[PDB]
């Protein structure tokens, strides 16, 4: 009799005095009594509010009021969601708004790209309101903690993994027997697991995996040559080859001519296969919202002829380019350095190294990874045991490092990352800028940071608990072959007992402003700021270790590469607290543990100031170095940076320059008219946080100002 | 000063005492009975010309409360709005829960080629769920909304409505190869074909088709042969210059026994070229069936040169052997064009390839048959002498689509496609007129209802076309730069109004069999009045389509809609509304367009005779289906008989199937609920 729940969830009484008020309101002006209203009230008096409305309609119809009743309800039910309509119209019309450029690699104009924005915008509120806890929600609402790749939470999707590419090639999913077959199987495997993850893929040992097939190609070539001209060349199968070099046939005869011909035709096929592989991972737009698969490759630690044959071919292909002398945006290539193998002039591969340098002085790649840097070393590494690639460090895309373990064996193959979240420190500092006692200021800062860290750890543990319940069959390829503990679980079982072999990351942003917006100067010009910065980082590392010991997981600190986050906190902070000089007068925040870009400094000082942090940030780091356009010709400068890196303890590097873009990619400082193409279109090619990004139109609206303020360390 | 905008849209004014009550309610729980001391000043400060809004007041009061070092008051003042907005929603929470839990619900299974147990599938499902309600308002019209609500008109691809996307196109794979977006070897062309298909898939939401495989891939075998002979000459010093423009009857490989001098140096090159082509085709077929897989089709069969014959032989052999350890391939779609005098008679030149195709279509059923010159596929400008050209011969696209006729252009099927097609239900219109005992009145009422609904559907299609007209050039990068007919001289920031007019619009029909099983008489099988009634209905629909085309200045074509997922949709609503009817709404699915029900046993000749006259009227699409028993595998004579029967009558398409994989999809686990019963109720036409 009395059960009325007005929409929402409130439980209220049946007043019975407004059901007449509303009907009277609907008849104020419709041309067309009190008795009829009383009869309707009596009839209805004989529940869910919404439903009953329909009955009311008929009571009005059987008597100019029904049309005046549903119309108003629909006209008010539509104005309640006039905020989503604006964003939907913005997406449909494909305008350059802040909500369509959060990722500079996608293309939102195409229907495929346009179909991802709706899913992201519809799935963010769901995870916000129905999955997270209350403390985490309140922390996130106030712009303190950030969750990365939030709009994948319900899918239970991991981030990155290193591919073991020996089971796939050997057993297939038929076995390969030529160079091209393996070269295509690699691409197939890479694109069939960037559909079960939201991060990137890396291949740690290119040479050690693709070497044993050049021998098979040579054997097939010799067999064909013997078939043509009847002879017995059986002995010339296991012939020790020092190098797979090519020479013109300018005068020779007998079996030597046949052997030289076989070598030449085995080299050409490898060159073709490598070129095809490069061209395959740069145009097949097949990864999701109209993207290219995020792929990286490792090499530089092999001595056999085949390995040194593959490296030379891939480097030559990269130098040559794709198209009319253009530059390939993918894959990411990183060179591995180790004294006694590559660096010293007496070592076996020092001639391929003095080249990586020449290529990197032209095409932005490869980068350099410093092995045995006092934390990348290992104890089970024998130089005479097939140059073990298992006991070596490999780096995934966007400054990610996974090398340490606590309940297994120290390796980097068949393991990856599960999630990582970021903590804002600028707001904590600015919240305590009204005190004069420095000791109390620092103590309050530390207390607040301690408070935030526990919430972050709880959030990571909650996400891990949610991911633990995923089924095996949701990841067919990534849970049968490519993982450190697969091959012993059915497709109708959980992955609870094979998931703990992973890493969790805690990051930070703006250490060049947070701890130094409270003091006179930053860590690039004041000697005393370095001590405070190192104290903060050490405190964070100690708390991370304590959390690892507590929750039974693997926590690590990381320098978050900010792409869409470079201008997200700044706007809200400026709106709330206003404008403070040298803190929030830039529209962007300097990346983690990095000197401000707009501060002029030489390479030596920058390296010395950014060196000690790399030991603490044991989840990822980087050391950028700009170079002017006229010093991009000499491949001598990329050798300073590397020896400077080696002198101190650093584990990652790169070099960047400006590049204007028929496709005449001239590197001069400024260009007016292209030499060949008369079109005025002249774009710029550079990197944002670890990958090159097209032209200066598909960028974020907040990180573009950073590109206009970079300074050119000359070397 | 007394005006505040509100969520509901009413503006009016504020008494300003409501805020005090709200704060009191907030504070009456935290065990902190604050008096009006703070409330007086907070109200005075927050009160200070219609400039305020309900959202702004919320933020202002929250900040002021936080500044009082209370927080908890704010904590449960903001924890009440959120628990209310949740109750104002979550009526669509069960669907999301089912999707997340990965259960076998009807929502998950709509397309059998998509995987719902992967992040990409879940993302697409969320996008579809959040975009379907949007189109129902702010885009359609009131009359169209009423029509669609009452289960009359079905709009295909309604998820992609706001994206302004077309459906399908025929690839002119010659400009792409000659001028790269230039191949010099067979492998490069094989890779570029797949790259083009994959990149063009995203810009549309339908299948892709290659209209002439041989005429495009032939000119590269000769270059491969030239390279091989040049390499062999480099090996052993000889001239070998003359042996470049040497005609070859056919590339056949034989053992190198008892050969010497300049005769062993040509058979070897031929063998190498054959192996190269075989490997390239095997790579193509293996790559287009395991790359996450673009519904693709390829057409071939009307070439007479040596290179085309080699390509066809190699691809047929690769298909016969199979991909993997003897597992039948699923994609791509292979169709064999039949021409009388070039590919059919024993005296013709491609008879052996025809027999090989008939032998492959018994164990690896997939090579279909397209009958050219079937009284409507003839073209007046097709002659085989100079190039034996291909731009004036029909080319299918799979999914029963057929785009061949235009009224403001050339009669071709290259670089043209279908824009959108809707479906009209004709079973409910008959179930609602099953009470009148006077037959003539029943027929007249049915025709009137059909006229009205058809006019509504035409208006809806025109509105969708008008919406799509405004799309811009940069919407589709590759499609509108090298592919779509006249679209080669338009700026990246210009409309596509000039080129879009060459597409086609399709009006589909479904359930012609059940429409008269008991509605207006007897079954479409053992009866003679059913044929006349069906012919009258289809002719009326065709005339209406023609007058619509003359009126709105567009292209309209009748269509036999494929069962995308519309096999258990209408039947459920009909069963719920009108209840159970013997022999009408008891099979939980409707037989496809102008077909004979599968559960009705009959021979091939009967089906051919019954379904022959309908094809001439369905100029937008049609299909012929035959089933056979296991034995069929080891006897290609049955396929020859079926094809001869098709040629004797007037038809334009065909296929054969043997009754786990079955017509293509994998194991019978990703099917829709409705089609499983249909599969379980299939018979065999020996
Ligand atoms: N407290 C109530 N007790 C009984 N009937 C009510 C009550 N409030 C509203 N009704 C009846 O229910 C109808 C629902 O109208 P209304 O749209 O206001 O619903 P609601 O759920 O209260 O939401 P809202 O006020 O936000 O629109 C009112 O027109 C009136 O007929
Ligand atoms: N001026 C009006 N003209 C037409 N219909 C009206 C009018 N005012 C209210 N209604 C009808 O009354 C209902 C809306 O009621 P209203 O928005 O006044 O909330 P309410 O029921 O009084 O709220 P609550 O119970 O939450 O206090 C809908 O049925 C709407 O059609
Ligand atoms: N009529 C009013 N005029 C001015 N301020 C108001 C009025 N009603 C409420 N407020 C205050 O402004 C806030 C507006 O937020 P709120 O979401 O409650 O608005 P609303 O439109 O009244 O909500 P709902 O329709 O969901 O009941 C209220 O929390 C209260 O603090
Ligand atoms: N029990 C409660 N505890 C805490 N806050 C509450 C409680 N009930 C309501 N509020 C707060 O009061 C406001 C909700 O008010 P409500 O929607 O009932 O209408 P109102 O503010 O009186 O205005 P209107 O005249 O539009 O109905 C929100 O600020 C909500 O946070
Ligand atoms: N095409 C891309 C781009 C980057 N990454 C991943 O996306 C993250 C982006 O870094 P970050 O800026 O910290 O996160 P967001 O701000 O959310 O980046 P975005 O908005 O572009 O997603 C990186 O860790 C990288 O692994 C990726 O998998 N796919
Ligand atoms: Zn140019």
Author numbering:
A (entry chain B): 2 to 33, 36 to 49, 55 to 71, 75 to 184, 192 to 679, 683 to 736
B (entry chain A): 2 to 49, 52 to 184, 193 to 303, 310 to 676, 705 to 708, 713 to 735
Task: Give the original sentences from the paper that presented this experimental model.
RNRs produce all four deoxyribonucleotides and are the only enzymes providing de novo building blocks for DNA replication and repair in all free-living organisms. Class III RNRs, which only function anaerobically, are dimers of an α subunit (NrdD) with a stable radical close to the active site, and binding sites for allosteric nucleotides. Binding of ATP activates RNR, and binding of dATP inhibits it.
Two-dimensional (2D) classes of particles extracted from micrographs of PcNrdD incubated with effector ATP and substrate CTP indicated only dimers, with no appreciable amounts of tetramer. As the ATP-cone density still did not permit reliable modelling, three-dimensional (3D) classification was carried out on this particle set, enabling the identification of a subset of 291,231 particles that gave a volume at 3.2 Å with better-defined ATP-cones. Two residues from the flap make H-bonds to CTP: Asn114 to the γ-phosphate group and Asn116 to the amino group of the cytosine base. Significantly, the NxN flap forms the nexus of a network of interactions between the substrate, the linker to the ATP-cone, the C-terminal GRD, and ‘loop 2’ (residues 304–311) that is responsible for communicating the substrate specificity signal from the s-site at the dimer interface to the active site. Important interactions linking the NxN flap to the C-terminus include H-bonds from Tyr712, which immediately follows the radical Gly711, to Glu581, which bridges to both the substrate and Ala115 in the flap, as well as from Arg719 in the GRD to the main chain carbonyl groups of Asn114 and Met117 in the flap. As the NxN flap appears to close off the top of the active site, we used the web server Caver Web v1.1 to analyse substrate access to the active site in the ATP-bound form, and identified a tunnel ~12 Å long leading from the surface of the protein to the active site that is 5.6 Å in diameter at its narrowest point.
